[PDB]
Every structure is written in C-alpha cells, then in structure tokens.
C-alpha cells in the first residue's frame, strides 16, 4: 500500500479557490489509483473522482465535475485537487486515497473553511455555580467561550491540574460564522469559596489568551 | 441516479465482548461483470479518517484482526464482530465500487451499552460581564446521562423556545459509558431583561417525570 501525506487546513472566503494536496509514497509494484472523498455534516461521505498516477486519466462524478480538477505531478509522486468557486456546503473534510486490487489507505484529510469571517478571539464568561448548579454535594461550573473564528479554541482548568470531571463541549457554530462552546467541570461543594477555578483559553489564531477565575 | 447504500441499524449500543453484525442494503446489484461484488466496510474513530476493514465483500484487509468478516449477496451486505474490542468503537460505513459513481453508506455509530442514567440538571444563568456586552446567555448542562437521546425544552415566561437554542453533546465517557449535553438559549441583552422566569425543562428515558431546573430575575 502506498503512504499519504496531505496538505494543511484552508481558510477561505466564499468565491475563493483552493489547492490541496497529497504526497505519494511506497515501495510498491502494485497498480494503483488515487481517489478524492468529501466527508461533510451536510451530505456524510462522497466520492469526487478517481485518477491514474501512471497516466493521469481522470474520472469524475457528475456533481463534482468542473467543481474539482484532479490532476497528478508524476515527479514528486503528488497528487492534487483544485476546488473553485466555493460556498458553504464546500467546508469540509478532504480525502486523498489510494485503491489496490488488495485494499487502499487514506490520508489524514484536509479541512477546508468556506466563511466570510474574520479571525477574532473569543470572549470569555463564567459560568457561576449556584444552588441551581448543585446536586447534593456536587457542583458544576464552567466556562463559556464565545464568538471566536477559526477553531480550535482550547481550555484547560487550574492551569491544567484539573482534568478530571471536565467536560469541553464541541463548539457549535452560530448564525453569525462565529463559534461557540461551553466548559464544564463538576467538583466538591465544600470546596466554593476555598479552593479557586480558574478556566485558561486559549485562541492561537487570534493570540488570545484568557484566565477566567468562576466562583458563586 | 447514484447507488443507495442504507445502513440498519444507526446506533448499535454493544457491551464489551459481544457479537456484533451491522447489515448494507444496495438499491442495484453491487456483482461487477468480472465477477468480484465490490462492497467495502470501514472503521471511522473519533478525529481520524476512515480506515479499511473488510474489501471486496469478505477480504480482510492487512492488519484487520480475525474477530472482523464480512459477508453477503450482490445486494445485502453483513459486517460481524465475533467479539467487540474498545477498539472498535466508532463509526462503520459501507462503500461500493462496483459502479460510477462510487457511493457510501450514511454510517452506523458502535457503542457502549449501559444501564439508564437519568441526567444531574443544572442551570446557569448569564454573567454581568456578558449582560454589559449587549447579549444574553442561559446554559442548560445535562450531566452524565444514558442513552444518549434527550429532549431540552426551554420556557421563558411560559413561552416555548424555538429556533434560539444550541445543543452540543460530548463522546461517550471512556469510563463510566454516559454522555453529557449542553443546551445554550442565546438572548438580546433587551429581550432577556423583559422577562423573569427562565426555565429548561429536560425528558429523558431514565427519569420518572420530565424535570424542570428554572431561575426567576
């Protein structure tokens, strides 16, 4: 079987054009093709096209056809796939793979971004516990991360001494183009007020960073 | 048009060393006229692409373990698990390459089986430092609870929500097997301040009742 390498996470405005790729690699005689597959929320998985890295014959499915163009560089054993003209229903997960007569491997997948944000960190809120986030004993608080564009954001707890019971809800995104997501941790009652909870955020894209102390 | 792969069933709750056996049903004859039938299952883990387990409707792929086979018609399909592995939990899809253009089933979510586990039910109201920022946001956390469907129902004065709410739900937890959900109902600053009862009320198979966790401003 033959080893994939893809190209990183694009960014792009709706209009735009992209080009990913996929780095070719194996001590193999077996004949081989190269295939693209889109994995998005709206649709699952599609298969886009197929192409042969001997000769470069291309075959397409009708709906990605002029869409996306395959093509190969036999030098550096690439494989590569322009996408055009692209919206929303284009953000997806990118797949590059091979096919055997004996099986195929896919590459890691490259995420592509169609939005007309711009990059902005978040902002961060508590979330107070309270007699409404108690449970006889057990408390919950957290953190609400909201409003920041690209993912990922991350959160950690007590500077990271806190790990377990946390929860890091996936984000959701709002109808803005922005996202959204919560943090949560469940601890001691006994504890508010004693022990400190400090949630730290962490936006790299926009170097936002954030320490958020939550108490009732 | 294209092929039709349905998967049965959507969500197969397993327990740890049982026998497992996820069915492909195609909409035309997947028997190529070279005679191989070209039906695929894959194993998708959270955060990774797919990858091949069973090729060409019962080969198994380099490195798949035994406890994996496939079998099948030219047109029903069957995966088996002799005996479920943590390892195997994710999402199985089926694929034909028999025809242009090649298609996928809409997947089968593998998972821990446990017993009911009603939700803990908390509320959060939102923070002076958000309400100075002109928005409002009630967070409604549903903490470890099976199985993972659960409806959350938000009431504001007595006036159902609808349409200004987002959930978001975690992976099964790798130790006690349960899931948690938040549900967000995002306000105006001006809308949130008209109103005094702010209520999430959440159904689920494990509790007797639904139940109501509320805060009144």
């Known amino acids: 079987q033959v080893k994939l390498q893809q190209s990183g996470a694009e960014f792009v405005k709706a209009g735009a054009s992209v080009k990913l790729s996929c780095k070719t690699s194996?001590?193999?005689?077996?004949?081989?093709?190269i295939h693209w597959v889109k994995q998005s929320p709206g649709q699952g998985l599609e298969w886009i096209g197929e192409?042969?890295?001997?000769?470069?014959?291309?075959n397409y499915n009708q709906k990605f056809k002029g869409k996306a163009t395959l093509t190969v560089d036999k030098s550096s054993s690439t494989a590569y796939m322009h996408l055009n003209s692209l919206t929303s229903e284009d953000s997806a997960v990118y797949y590059c793979?091979?096919?055997?007569?004996?099986?195929?491997?896919w590459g890691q997948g490259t995420t592509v971004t169609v939005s007309s944000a711009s990059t902005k960190g978040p902002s961060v809120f508590p979330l107070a516990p309270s007699s409404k986030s108690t449970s006889g004993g057990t408390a919950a608080l957290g953190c609400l991360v909201k409003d920041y564009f690209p993912e990922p954001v991350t959160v950690s707890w007590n500077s990271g001494a806190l790990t377990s019971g946390v929860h890091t809800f996936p984000a959701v995104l709002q109808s803005s183009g922005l996202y959204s997501l919560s943090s949560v941790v469940t601890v001691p009652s006994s504890s508010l007020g004693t022990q400190t909870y400090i949630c730290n955020v962490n936006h790299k894209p926009s170097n936002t960073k954030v320490d958020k102390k939550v108490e009732p | 048009s294209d092929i039709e792969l349905t998967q049965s069933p959507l969500s197969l709750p397993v327990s740890l060393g049982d026998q497992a056996s996820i069915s492909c049903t195609s909409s035309?004859?997947?028997?190529?006229?070279?005679?191989?039938?070209?039906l695929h299952w894959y194993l998708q883990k959270p955060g990774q692409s797919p990858k091949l387990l069973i090729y060409?409707?019962?080969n198994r792929f380099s490195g798949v373990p035994d406890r994996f086979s496939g079998s099948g018609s030219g047109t029903d399909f069957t995966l088996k698990i002799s005996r479920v592995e943590a390892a195997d939990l994710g999402i199985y899809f089926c694929?034909?390459?028999?025809?242009?253009?090649?298609?996928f089933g809409g997947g089968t979510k593998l998972e821990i089986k446990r017993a009911d586990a009603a939700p803990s039910v908390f509320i959060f109201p939102p923070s002076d430092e958000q309400l100075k920022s002109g928005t409002a946001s009630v967070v409604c956390l549903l903490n470890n609870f099976y199985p993972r469907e659960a409806k959350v129902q938000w009431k504001v004065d007595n006036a159902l929500q609808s349409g200004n709410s987002q959930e978001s739900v975690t992976e099964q937890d790798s130790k006690d097997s349960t899931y948690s959900l938040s549900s967000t109902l995002t306000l105006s600053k001006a809308d949130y301040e008209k109103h005094k009862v702010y209520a999430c009320e959440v159904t689920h198979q494990g509790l007797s009742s639904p139940v109501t966790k509320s805060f009144n401003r």
């Open positions: 194996g001590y193999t005689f077996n004949n081989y093709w």
């Open positions: 192409i042969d890295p001997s000769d470069g014959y291309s």
């Open positions: 060409t409707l019962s």
């Open positions: 793979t091979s096919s055997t007569s004996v099986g195929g491997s």
């Open positions: 694929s034909q390459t028999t025809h242009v253009p090649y298609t």
């Open positions: 035309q004859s997947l028997l190529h006229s070279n005679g191989d039938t070209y």
